[PDB]
Write a protein that binds this ligand. Structure first.
Ligand SMILES: [Mg+2]
Ligand SMILES: [Mg+2]
Ligand SMILES: [Mg+2]
Ligand SMILES: [Mg+2]
Ligand SMILES: [Mg+2]
Ligand SMILES: [Mg+2]
Ligand SMILES: [Mg+2]
Ligand SMILES: [Mg+2]
Ligand SMILES: [Mg+2]
Ligand SMILES: [Mg+2]
Ligand SMILES: [Mg+2]
Ligand SMILES: [Mg+2]
Ligand SMILES: [Mg+2]
Ligand SMILES: [Mg+2]
Ligand SMILES: [Mg+2]
Ligand SMILES: [Mg+2]
Ligand SMILES: [Mg+2]
Ligand SMILES: [Mg+2]
Ligand SMILES: [Mg+2]
Ligand SMILES: [Mg+2]
Ligand SMILES: [Mg+2]
Ligand SMILES: [Mg+2]
Ligand SMILES: [Mg+2]
Ligand SMILES: [Mg+2]
Ligand SMILES: [Mg+2]
Lengths: 181, 53, 187, 50, 124
RNA sequence: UGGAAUGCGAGUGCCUAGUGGGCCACUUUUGGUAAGCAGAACUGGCGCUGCGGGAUGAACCGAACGCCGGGUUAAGGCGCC
RNA sequence: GGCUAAAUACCGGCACGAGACCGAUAGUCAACAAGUACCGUAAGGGAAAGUUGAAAAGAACUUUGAAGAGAGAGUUCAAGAGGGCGUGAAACCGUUAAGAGGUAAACGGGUGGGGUCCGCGCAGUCCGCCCGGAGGAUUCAACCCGGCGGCGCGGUCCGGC
């Protein structure tokens, strides 16, 4: 595994990545550019608003046909959308990265999204049936994502309503563990 | 049925054999062929018939 | 701009033998020096002919050499031909000749030598006749070739005795129409 | 250049522009100079010019 | 003869190097490593060769004896000169001029001997 | 006294590709009301050819072209562009 | 009416040998579960598709996640070789860095500015002879001995081929 960039101080950084993820590449490249440079607590808070349609992801490069909204004015841009799957996929990668920071004994409340890159993955093939007995591609556009988090001097403790939540138990995880045991 | 084979006149073939043998008695030509004959006593190098056995 | 045509600037003529023979080129080196460093035009003419192609160096028959070397005033001169001296069986008696040639056929050597004659090589002629003195330069017939039968006016034109190109020769091969008045016409 | 002018200019040896030659005058040559009249400037040179 | 043998090797020889618009000859007794009729060390009856001694002291002068042209073993006479720089050249100059042994190689031999001797000095 | 001037080295032989739609201008010229029309003679052009001028332009005017420095010109120009 | 071996032919078959042939879009359609998959009612039509590593040593174990996926750890010379894995181009794309941006971009000539690096620059060459100061010697010429070599019209020496 090689990342496009290298951490400046590897002892103060945590990595995360994912490949062949079935979330639109175009929506996700825009979503990642929004959180570039964000503090992790701010970044996590932001992506949850995007799911609730309380903050938009400005569509700056892949904006052909994208509509206008009042929340894109926050970014000095007229076009914005709320890609829910892109936000949710990045919330999982951030959660994985934050756990990686803990495994390395890093102050998770000081992490900043320093590098984040969305790459096109190999495209998955389906087909759609067209008029006059013709068949055309129906292609998914998955992506690879990689993010590096670094420590900075600004500290944001985690929200109170978030640290008080129960460690959710998954029955299906218990079943498999019992079967292995 | 490409024409793989060439007829060469007999007289010209024998000429070539004569020129190759004449050029084999000259140290310069044998040297220029890369042969290490800097110490062979003589050219042409004739050795008694015992070796045939 | 200068008003001149350039189609004739480059003269077509040999400056060296197309042949890669190393003995021919050693003679050309020899006669390059002689032609340059002597005022003899015989040296220049010989040098030129060493470049000439095979068909520009026709063979000289033994009979023709004797005929040209028998003319008055040519006694005790060296016959010089840049080419091959072939033999002529049609000759009965060969006199004593002194010849210089590039090649002499095996049977022409025995006949010339048996009569007391001498056969030189062009490197020996230079030592004997550096300027070409006392020589008789001789050439074989240049139009003595089957090709020159076919050149000239096309065979189907009036008073054109050119030889046509026919695969076979006989009554059935280009003799009917155009070659007799009975079939169309003749000319 | 017309074929007649072109031939007369080569005979005078004026094959290039601003080329100069001396010509000794007589009925044969004065009539040649008339043919190339549009293509030449000519006159009588004095000793210093020569 | 030399001229006949040059015509066979002038462009076909295992010693011929044609590279970078340059032509060289790597045979022994070639005082300039030059693919040339004059400096070819094989085709002439008499040749001069200058080489460094097996130990890095002095030069070895090679001259081709007259008699055994077809006998490579006895053809060449080797002489080792390990004198001072000026003395070495003087011997080489005399071995050529006084004997009239290829007088046209005199300076080529003398220039080669200087280059070999200069090479044998300590490297700075 | 190689018998006008001028200029110029010539002669000769084989093998031979492409081409065989052309078109334009001065002068001359047929048909047509005429045509940026159709058809001819002569030369020269474009085609195959850039370059300076004609703002622009196949052909007009000047002039034909290796890569450069200096100088001078042609046809054209010199209010500003 | 009739028979008859041999010398001759042989892109099928069995078994071999070789090559100035091709080298995975080539060479047979077929280097591989190819006359296979698949298409057509049928006669017929008919592909794509080779490569981890020397050796599976094919990544135990910890941790986040429902999982796919990750972060550590480990094997290996190398996973910067991780099971459609040798190398890994271009087009196309992500990000980073630098520069710039109203006559679409691109382009020829001439400079200028800025970077990337290179000279592995920064008191600037080397060589011969001669003059002079200081030194140090496997110390010079000339003669003697020995070896080798070139040439000799040795005006015409002997012997050899
Ligand atoms: Mg649109
Ligand atoms: Mg719409
Ligand atoms: Mg249908
Ligand atoms: Mg010119
Ligand atoms: Mg031309
Ligand atoms: Mg020509
Ligand atoms: Mg017309
Ligand atoms: Mg055309
Ligand atoms: Mg033309
Ligand atoms: Mg033009
Ligand atoms: Mg105008
Ligand atoms: Mg100029
Ligand atoms: Mg029968
Ligand atoms: Mg393949
Ligand atoms: Mg194939
Ligand atoms: Mg392929
Ligand atoms: Mg290939
Ligand atoms: Mg294939
Ligand atoms: Mg491959
Ligand atoms: Mg391997
Ligand atoms: Mg490697
Ligand atoms: Mg590898
Ligand atoms: Mg591969
Ligand atoms: Mg690979
Ligand atoms: Mg930028």
């Amino acid at each position: 595994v090689r990342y496009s960039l290298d951490p400046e101080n590897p002892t103060k950084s945590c990595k995360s990545r994912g490949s062949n993820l079935r979330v639109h590449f175009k929506n996700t490249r825009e979503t990642a550019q929004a959180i570039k440079g964000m503090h992790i607590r701010k970044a996590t808070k932001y992506l949850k608003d995007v799911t609730l349609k309380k903050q938009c992801v400005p569509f700056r490069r892949y904006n052909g046909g994208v509509g206008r909204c009042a929340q894109a004015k926050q970014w000095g841009w007229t076009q914005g959308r709320w890609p829910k799957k892109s936000a949710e996929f990045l919330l999982h990668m951030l959660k994985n990265a934050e756990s990686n920071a803990e495994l390395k004994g890093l102050d998770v409340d000081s992490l900043v999204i320093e590098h984040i890159q969305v790459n096109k993955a190999p495209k998955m093939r389906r087909r759609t049936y067209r008029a006059h007995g013709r068949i055309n591609p129906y292609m998914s556009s998955p992506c690879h994502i990689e993010m590096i988090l670094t420590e900075k001097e600004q500290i944001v403790p985690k929200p109170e309503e978030e640290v008080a939540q129960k460690k959710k138990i998954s029955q299906k995880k218990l079943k498999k563990q019992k079967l292995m045991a | 049925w490409r024409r793989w084979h060439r007829r060469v006149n007999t007289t010209q073939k024998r000429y070539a054999i004569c020129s190759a043998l004449a050029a084999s008695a000259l140290p310069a030509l044998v040297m220029s062929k890369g042969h290490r004959i800097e110490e062979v006593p003589e050219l042409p190098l004739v050795v008694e018939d015992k070796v045939e056995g | 701009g200068v008003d001149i045509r350039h189609n004739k600037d480059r003269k077509v003529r040999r400056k060296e033998p197309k042949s890669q023979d190393i003995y021919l080129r050693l003679l050309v080196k020899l006669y390059r020096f002689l032609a340059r460093r002597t005022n003899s035009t015989f040296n220049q003419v010989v040098l030129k002919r060493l470049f000439m192609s095979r068909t520009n160096r026709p063979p000289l028959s033994l009979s023709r050499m004797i005929r040209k070397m028998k003319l008055p005033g040519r006694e005790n001169k060296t016959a010089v031909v840049v080419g091959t001296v072939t033999d002529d069986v049609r000759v009965q008696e060969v006199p004593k000749l002194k010849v210089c040639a590039l090649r002499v056929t095996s049977r022409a050597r025995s006949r010339i030598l048996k009569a007391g004659g001498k056969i030189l090589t062009f490197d020996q002629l230079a030592l004997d006749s550096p300027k070409g003195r006392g020589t008789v330069l001789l050439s074989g017939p240049r139009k003595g070739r089957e090709v020159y039968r076919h050149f000239g006016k096309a065979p189907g034109t009036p008073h054109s005795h050119t030889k046509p190109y026919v695969r076979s020769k006989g009554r059935k091969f280009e003799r009917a129409r155009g070659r007799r008045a009975s079939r169309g016409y003749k000319n | 250049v017309s074929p007649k002018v072109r031939k007369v200019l080569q005979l005078l040896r004026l094959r290039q522009i601003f080329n100069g030659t001396f010509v000794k005058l007589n009925k044969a040559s004065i009539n040649m100079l008339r043919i190339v009249e549009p293509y030449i400037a000519w006159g009588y040179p004095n000793l210093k010019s020569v | 003869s030399a001229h006949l043998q040059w015509m066979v090797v002038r462009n076909c020889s295992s010693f011929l190097i044609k590279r970078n618009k340059q032509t060289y000859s790597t045979e022994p007794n070639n005082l300039k490593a030059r693919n040339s009729f004059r400096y070819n060390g094989l085709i002439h009856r008499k040749t001069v060769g200058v080489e460094p001694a097996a130990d890095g002291k002095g030069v070895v002068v090679v001259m081709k004896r007259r008699s055994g042209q077809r006998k490579p073993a006895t053809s060449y006479v080797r002489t080792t000169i390990n004198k001072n720089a000026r003395a070495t050249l003087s011997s080489i100059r005399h071995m050529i001029r006084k004997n009239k042994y290829h007088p046209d190689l005199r300076m080529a031999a003398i220039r080669r001997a200087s280059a070999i001797l200069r090479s044998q000095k300590p490297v700075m």
